[PDB]
Symmetry: D2
Subunit: 392 residues, 4 copies
């Protein structure tokens, strides 16, 4: 079995099948012709090799799909036009009125919005459980419960989940486990190998790695992905990934190992630096020993990742002055780009909110999330240095 980086470069593709082309050609085409109508009948019945329309399937998307399937260790992959594309396509096919979905305690803003203000308003019951608390989960299981969905680590506290523990419970009750594995990437965490059924990504983040596409991946069993493709994607979202973006995504995946190694190495130093500072109150970085859930994080994630969350003494005001002081970090939402991004949900994403509304959710007054990039660490240190001095 060839290694991770080998597979990220080579898996699913022989140059000799495409006129010797070293980089696979991009199938920037909407439709594919048939030799016969009989051949074309068989492609809608779904019982052959080949193609018909790019919304369903496309060779450039198929290579990306298979290759991602290999990295995560799953049977099938599906490519979609965004992370939300992946999540919504997946959830729209597995859930019908009167089914229940168990969710992690904290979710990504638009995943939360989709669940509560979207599918949740179509008669699907919602319920939030601590996915580190196996006791609380096992209680909350009912026969109506069809899907268990969560992020590990979770946005933005880095709250972990006992994936193996959750999956053993779900296996007994018949529930399908779906993990948003965006923050880690298969390089760092493979939830399918810990019993999960499906993993979804925002490929927009670390997989692409260069902040120039919006994209989504689903990986899991052949049976589950076939359904999500032929219902969620085909009928219910239309979240079709451009072959051009699919090709750029594959370009990024070829440096995933190298990019994450450095993300994690830079993140480590900045976390350890931030720990030893009078301005900081607490830090949520999985590779600091003071991290609440250090043990579980290391059983699942091979490295601590590139994301640091931390709160400041001075709260809302200390954040604004810190964020505005940054001359190298960019004030922006998103993560996993080569460029180092900072965001402060208190006065950016959730700014029209007041302090009285924020505490409802698991989202602090002083909380500033970093996505540590690939820049020279000494420059990143110096930028954070002056930004903390400016936040007094």
């Amino acid at each position: 079995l060839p290694g991770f980086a080998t597979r990220a470069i080579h898996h699913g593709y022989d140059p000799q099948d495409h006129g010797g082309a070293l980089v696979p050609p991009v199938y920037q085409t909407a439709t594919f012709t048939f030799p016969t109508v009989e051949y074309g009948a068989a492609c809608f019945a779904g019982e052959q090799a080949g193609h018909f329309y790019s919304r369903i399937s496309n060779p450039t998307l198929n290579l990306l799909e298979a290759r991602m399937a290999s990295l995560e260790g799953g049977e099938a992959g599906l490519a979609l036009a965004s992370g939300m594309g992946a999540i919504t396509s997946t959830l729209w096919t597995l859930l019908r009125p009167g089914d229940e979905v168990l969710l992690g305690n904290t979710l990504y803003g638009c995943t939360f919005a989709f669940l509560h203000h979207g599918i949740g308003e179509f008669g699907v019951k919602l319920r939030h459980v601590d996915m580190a608390d196996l006791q609380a989960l096992e209680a909350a299981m009912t026969p109506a419960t069809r899907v268990i969905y969560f992020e590990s680590p979770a946005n933005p506290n880095m709250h972990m989940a006992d994936i193996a523990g959750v999956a053993k419970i779900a296996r007994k009750h018949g529930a399908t486990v779906v993990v948003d594995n965006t923050y880690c990437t298969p390089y760092l965490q493979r939830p399918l190998e810990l019993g999960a059924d499906l993993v979804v990504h925002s490929a927009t983040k670390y997989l692409s790695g260069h902040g120039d596409i919006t994209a989504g991946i689903v990986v899991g069993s052949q049976a589950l992905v076939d359904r999500i493709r032929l219902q969620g994607l085909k009928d219910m979202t239309g979240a079709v990934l451009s072959p051009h973006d699919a090709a750029l995504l594959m370009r990024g995946i070829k440096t995933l190992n190298l990019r994450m190694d450095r993300h994690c190495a830079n993140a480590q130093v900045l976390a350890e630096f931030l720990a030893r500072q009078p301005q900081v109150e607490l830090i949520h970085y999985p590779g600091l020993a003071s991290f609440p859930q250090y043990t579980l994080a290391r059983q699942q994630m091979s490295q601590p990742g590139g994301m640091i969350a931390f709160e400041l003494k001075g709260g809302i005001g200390a954040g604004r002055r810190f964020m505005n002081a940054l001359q190298l970090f960019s004030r922006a939402v998103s993560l996993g780009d080569a460029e180092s991004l900072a965001q402060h949900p208190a006065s950016m994403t959730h700014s029209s909110y007041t302090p009285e509304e924020r505490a409802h959710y698991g989202i602090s007054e002083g909380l500033v999330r970093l996505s540590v990039g690939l820049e020279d660490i000494d420059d990143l240190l110096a930028d954070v240095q002056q930004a903390l001095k400016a936040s007094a």
Copy 2:
């Protein structure tokens, strides 16, 4: 107000805002930064002009949107990953359980699938009506009727609706009218100007014009597009258009008028040919005096379009052999490409079942659909001629 071709080339863009670039640069970026946090606060409150993340909005996509809005005579536009992306995003935000939606009698298959096996399995009521029969439409209306959705001309029999008559009934009862205007494009038909609220396109077809992108456009009021953008696209489908494909779509649109002129002139000659041949039993083309809704066709479409549908005397068998015989025409689903295409749904998209399923779901045994391309008309004629002989 400048002419169609002028607007389809220039609307919404001045080179002097982008370093004098004649062609607008492609914003192939997932995320955008802010100079301060208080600036970025307003971009999430929706109260200050600018960008944050390409799933919600992007400048390349905004240009496409605004330009498409001008061509349809609408206030605002939204760009999506596919036509189904356009449809699902739209209907997911506009309907909730208990709402009734009146559909036209025939619909494009994935739209039929989405309605009956997708959204209509989450407690949304569906009824089918002949939108040509204004008495029956009026009679079909209820207060719970929230949406009237149809294609005009309809897949795959070219059936027509009086858009203004339908809109009048919709103003009476208080219902939103959504027209799928793929077949015609804004160049030949503008449903908003005949009282429609929203129009949806598969921009994959005529608007693209070159078979290379998958895309969708919604055009309507600012109020409705904003809801579709902020809920259907953002939370519920994630069907985000690549700035690459958005830019190609705009390239395609620059020759829309010229391309449609040729599609229509070619299709007219081919329709009049097909009507004279002994192998052909019925022909549906709007530019033929024999078309049942001929008056309405000239009253509502400025030209009769590029699509022909017809039936061969020898049934399914003759269709197969007609289809197999084509050397210039390509066997493929889809329409609106430079390349002339044909399909015989009876032995392609809707194959396995006997005549009895194909009757009630109104697609004849011998029905062949043609998307007439931009090739030399003599070449197309010659290909169709020999294919008819071979059909017997």
Copy 3:
């Protein structure tokens, strides 16, 4: 009636020629080979790709399947054996002249050339011992008279940039058959849809595919079309060794997209320009006006003889001089102030206050242009909007 040996029409071939979807997974649009290098099954299937026998691929700077399709298709349209695709028009010109010419060879040139072509010849290749001579190519007696034994290449544009001077291409090729020269014709302005120098006796044509062939102003590209032997030579020396002007398969894919509507776009360019040129000639403000479709145009009968339609380029002079032209341009709200052609967008330039602004009034004649001159590339906008813009712009030059 008639059978398979009939040539498919121009629009059919501009969309289909050289590509059957069945040889590429059924993909209706050809896959873009956005790859720099190609691999070999055995080590000997690499050996034969460099030398002699094999049909196949190794490196994109010599040959790429996306570029090959473009090439074969441009060849069909021009009526040539072979095509080559390059990074720019100047890529096509330099790559061609670098392989056909050596020190001591003479090149006979059209009286006017495109600026960077003129520069290439006088200040580039001409300084490496290639001898230069200009002749009015409309004068077949003068051309005959200028032929020497060292004359290796007759090169020229028709119509020329920017005065739209023309040459008898068949007349030139006949003179060249007798003496032995290779005729190269820059066919940018007409495109294969309006004029086909190869079918009138020219040995090679070159294009700035950046213009009408692309049609949408988003790529820079060149094409050479001509005999297999001459194109192969150009590919294997001019492009391989001497320019490295390699076309991106991305841009080659877009050029093929533009070529799918060439006939339609040229039809509309020409229709607009004819209506605009006839309008322009009847206006008070205009001194003269060159446009091949007007009978006043000096070479009206040659234009009709060689071009199937009169093109999208207009030239005219204003009353009021530079001061009027200066105001005319600034008054344009729909036309752009730019130098290029063959875009969907209509472009104007007033060389007095633009491209030759640093020059002085009298220096214009003996470098070679007028004082109220305005070149127009007529685009694809609704003709009424283009009239209204030129009308109000004339009124502001008054």
Copy 4:
């Protein structure tokens, strides 16, 4: 002065100058307009700093150029359509009939072809010299010597030049020193800092990193680069880089350091392995302690590179059998891709030659060149190992 990684990600670009876009927009446009004739007057002069045509100066290309300049420690940059683009544009500008160019003893095939069968046949003198031998260089200099051109390390044996010694000899005679820095990249070796005047790159190799573009770079003094822009590129080659490919190149440059680190570590290992084999007659890798020019190599190269050349004892025949048995390395010319590549010049690029014409030229019978890729070293070892066993 920020670190190499920081500059390779940020240099020359602020998001705020383009609507906050994190990644810069791609200026896929041929022409640029002017607001007035007075503005457009000075773009054919120089005193107004805008744009006019993309063959001369495009915003996307300029960013690439400025950034490549920064990494190389030079004043200014030029982007071109291929490595040969950069080489030919540079040499056509600097050389004329009667001028002599001094060359490194062995050059890349098409550079040798350009010099001897292109520009050499226009009255330009050629002389090859050993560029490590400063005594032989000074002796070779004449008044006609205007340019000194070489690779370091060079094809095929990794033969170094003494760049600082060469520049010292050139400074005496006024001549210009041009260094092909393709193999090393600015990450490993910066010839301008050691006294050279111009560097050229086939950005097609390591700079891109991913084998999907063809691009050239020139970096040097503003006056020199300006001339190669306005003479070599504008008039004499027209080797204009696509903004699309220039965008990809810059995408590739953001992982240059990380990719070069891994290339070099995989090479280090695989050379240590190869140097101890019974099948290996001789091996050229800069990092081996027994490399002839080891000391000088480490004065210029911060790491020994990703390329290995070695000789098999069985001659041309063993090379053939080794090449063919490789299942993971691809058989191709080119280098610096993520995918590992191998060529055996004696049965590929130079097979039409006879046994005695290879030595004359400067190539061995059993010489195999390896571009060591980014794959898992254990897979690469396995593949080379079995290929060595099958070579006997």
